């Protein structure tokens, strides 16, 4: 149905020294398609999905230059932010950038964003209207004043409603085999006794795409808010995703409990109960 | 008021010399650029720099060095002076990469292999026709800069000692005297027009002058004429009732 | 890579609409620029465009069609001061801001009195040196230069007497120490039909 393109950026000052670690990655949906790493050999934007390889030399030169440019902006940033927060040069610091766009099921523009962090707390973020800024603290208000006079939002809105959206469609059409696929979750349930009167039922969902899934437990047709362990959705490393959800059950009453799986690759929601 | 300056505005190089073109900027801009402009193929990117400390190569970086020590300065330096590097050179800058670029003054640069073919202009003011005055009641003085190499010239008219910007036109490009030979000498012409009332009045001064940008004063000179430096060669006319 | 402009020189008469186009090779270019450059001067910006479609500024319309790789500048109502070489600039990466070859525009004045004539002027550097002036013709007349390496003929130039509200098109010809006829000079590509040669 609805899609997204997203670019992620990390610069770490390694200092008393300098020369920062820069890594950039691009995703379409839950699939990585490009990367840059300053540590890596090539100093180029590199393909990380089959469908991006068909792009020409113009694209790779254009992305390399634009990614190299992001990096050197962030290097000046690291110098500047030390000054704005009176931090010394002995310690390591981190900037982070995220931008991208969402589209709906018709592939029309839904929402854009451009956010920025320093030392893992929010610094400055573009508001949903794409014409104004939320600045977190007082140093970020100085950045907000710079960016207001420089028309950064105007430029960002042009990218986020045009170029982001128009390239997302192109990526979705060139790799429609990969990107417009939905791997349904493959589900099972295991049973483990912890004592002589209690037992753990663990409901599994394996090899699904996209990563968005909802696992819920129900005792006699009613949502189990209580004793529910529920892990972080983890990757398999082949492109697909895994997740479980577990509950503790007083023994011999295991058949009272139902596991409910909703994911968009499924024709109907799934109901596993143990047996 | 924050701007962009280049230095110098004009230069004549010997072959195999070294020359640094300065470019500085008050405007706190991150990105800076160098361009060459030639008579057929427009502006052409030599080098760029997205932020202070960092550089990059454009379409024609060959022969050209570049440096970015600070936000303000972006000097272009030419290691060996080839005759191919004769151009007009433009420094520029933008607030960040991909935004609007603001250009410097420009730099006319001519690398010559022989200093013994560099000449100042010979200037003459031709006083208007008898027949023009009786037909139109306007009077046109023409000027003629001739016999000069290279085309580093700026022409101006002066009435009574005051410069004029109306009634005047000058040729767009200079014109080669022998339009075939290597390193050929150029000619420039320009016309000033005023009425017969302004012209036939005897208490009116008319001066056509040519600012030729010649050799530096630090240059090798050995031969038969005087040293062809940066000079204004003027040519004069007075009003006449005849 | 390639930025190709609408190949000049264009010649659009006064008060009309001039139109210049720009094509570029990079599908992913995101910023686009129009510059004006006078004779021996810096480029100065007319407009930037980022989004697809039309941008308005006075007598100037920017048009961007990214799918077609197309930028254009439509100049309405063109004055004689709009005569310059026009420059298109497309950004190809970070600092890879790349330009077209330039399209030369000359907005040619309506000559209110097309009264063509050829005069011979005497010098102030003596009163023996000869030169020729061909002045006050209309903007349909053009100029050629070749008979030999003797007769140097300059191009069509336009002056303006602002106070007297009058325009004048002119050209200069000379040839040093010869039997140089002032009547037989300007007619390589043929002169106006009633040009005054008052000898």
């Amino acid at each position: 149905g609805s899609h997204s393109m997203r670019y992620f950026f990390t610069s770490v000052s390694r200092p008393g020294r300098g020369e920062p670690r820069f890594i950039a990655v691009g995703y379409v949906d839950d699939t990585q398609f490009v990367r840059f790493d300053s540590d890596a050999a090539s100093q180029r934007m590199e393909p990380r999905a089959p469908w991006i390889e068909q792009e020409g030399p113009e694209y790779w030169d254009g992305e390399t230059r634009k990614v190299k440019a992001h990096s050197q902006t962030h290097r000046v940033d690291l110098g500047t932010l030390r000054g704005y927060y009176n931090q010394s040069e002995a310690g390591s610091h981190t900037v982070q950038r995220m931008y991208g766009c969402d589209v709906g099921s018709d592939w029309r523009f839904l929402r854009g964003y451009h956010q920025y962090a320093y030392d893992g707390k929010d610094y400055i973020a573009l508001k949903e209207d794409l014409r104004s800024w939320t600045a977190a603290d007082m140093a970020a208000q100085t950045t907000k004043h710079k960016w207001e006079a420089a028309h950064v939002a105007e430029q960002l809105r042009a990218y986020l409603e045009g170029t982001c959206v128009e390239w997302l469609r192109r990526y979705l059409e060139n790799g429609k085999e990969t990107l417009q696929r939905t791997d349904a979750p493959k589900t099972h349930m295991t049973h483990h006794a912890v004592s002589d009167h209690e037992a753990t039922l663990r409901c599994w969902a394996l090899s699904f795409y996209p990563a968005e899934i909802t696992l819920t437990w129900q005792r006699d047709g009613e949502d189990q808010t209580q004793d529910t362990e529920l892990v972080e959705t983890r990757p398999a490393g082949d492109g697909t995703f895994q997740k479980w959800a577990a509950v503790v059950v007083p023994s011999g009453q295991e058949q009272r409990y139902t596991c409910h799986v909703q994911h968009e690759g499924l024709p109907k929601p799934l109901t596993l109960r143990w047996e | 008021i924050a701007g962009i300056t280049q230095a110098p505005t004009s230069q004549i190089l010997a072959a195999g010399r070294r020359m640094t073109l300065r470019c500085t900027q008050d405007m706190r801009h991150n990105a800076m650029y160098w361009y060459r402009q030639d008579l057929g193929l427009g502006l052409r990117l030599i080098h760029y720099s997205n932020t202070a400390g960092t550089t990059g190569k454009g379409e024609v970086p060959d022969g050209y060095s570049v440096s970015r020590a600070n936000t303000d300065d972006f000097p272009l330096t030419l290691a060996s002076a080839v005759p191919s590097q004769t151009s007009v050179y433009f420094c520029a800058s933008s607030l960040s990469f991909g935004t609007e670029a603001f250009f410097g003054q420009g730099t006319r640069l001519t690398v010559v292999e022989d200093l013994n073919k560099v000449f100042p202009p010979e200037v003459a003011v031709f006083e208007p026709s008898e027949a023009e005055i009786s037909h139109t009641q306007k009077a046109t003085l023409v000027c003629l800069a001739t016999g000069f190499y290279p085309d580093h010239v700026e022409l101006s008219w002066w009435v009574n000692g005051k410069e004029v910007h109306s009634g005047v036109c000058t040729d767009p490009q200079p014109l080669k005297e022998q339009p075939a030979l290597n390193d050929s000498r150029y000619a420039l012409s320009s016309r000033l027009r005023v009425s017969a009332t302004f012209w036939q009045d005897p208490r009116n001064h008319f001066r056509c002058q040519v600012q030729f940008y010649g050799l530096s004063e630090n240059d090798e000179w050995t031969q038969d004429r005087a040293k062809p430096v940066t000079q204004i060669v003027s040519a004069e006319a007075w009003g006449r009732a005849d | 890579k390639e930025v190709e402009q609408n190949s000049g020189p264009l010649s659009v008469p006064e008060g009309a609409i001039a139109s210049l186009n720009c094509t570029y090779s990079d599908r992913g270019s995101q910023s686009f620029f129009w510059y004006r450059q006078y004779s021996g001067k810096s480029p100065e910006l007319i407009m930037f465009i980022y989004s697809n479609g039309d941008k308005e500024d006075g007598r100037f319309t920017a048009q961007l069609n990214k799918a077609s790789q197309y930028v254009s500048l439509l100049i309405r109502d063109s004055q004689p001061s709009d005569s310059a070489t026009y420059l298109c600039a497309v950004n190809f990466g970070g600092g890879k801001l790349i330009f077209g070859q330039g399209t030369e525009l000359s907005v040619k004045p309506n000559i209110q009195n097309p009264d063509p004539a050829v005069y011979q002027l005497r010098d102030s550097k003596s009163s023996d040196k000869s030169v020729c002036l061909f002045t006050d013709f209309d903007s349909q007349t053009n100029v050629s230069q070749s008979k030999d390496s003797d007769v140097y003929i300059t191009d069509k130039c336009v002056l303006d007497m602002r106070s007297m509200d009058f325009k004048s098109n002119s050209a200069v010809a000379w040839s040093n120490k010869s039997d140089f006829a002032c009547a037989n000079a300007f007619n390589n590509s043929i002169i106006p039909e009633d040009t005054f040669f008052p000898s």
Binding site: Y7, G26, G62, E63, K66, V67, A69, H70, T73, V76, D77, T80, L81, Y99, H114, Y116, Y123, I124, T143, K146, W147, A150, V152, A153, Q155, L156, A158, Y159, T163, C164, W167 | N30, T51, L95, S96, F97, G98, T99 | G28, S29, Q30, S31, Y50, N91, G93, G94
Partner: peptide
């Protein structure tokens, strides 16, 4: 595609 505008020093 990456942003070729709108990316400015803080």
């Amino acid at each position: 595609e990456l942003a070729g505008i709108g990316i400015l020093t803080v």
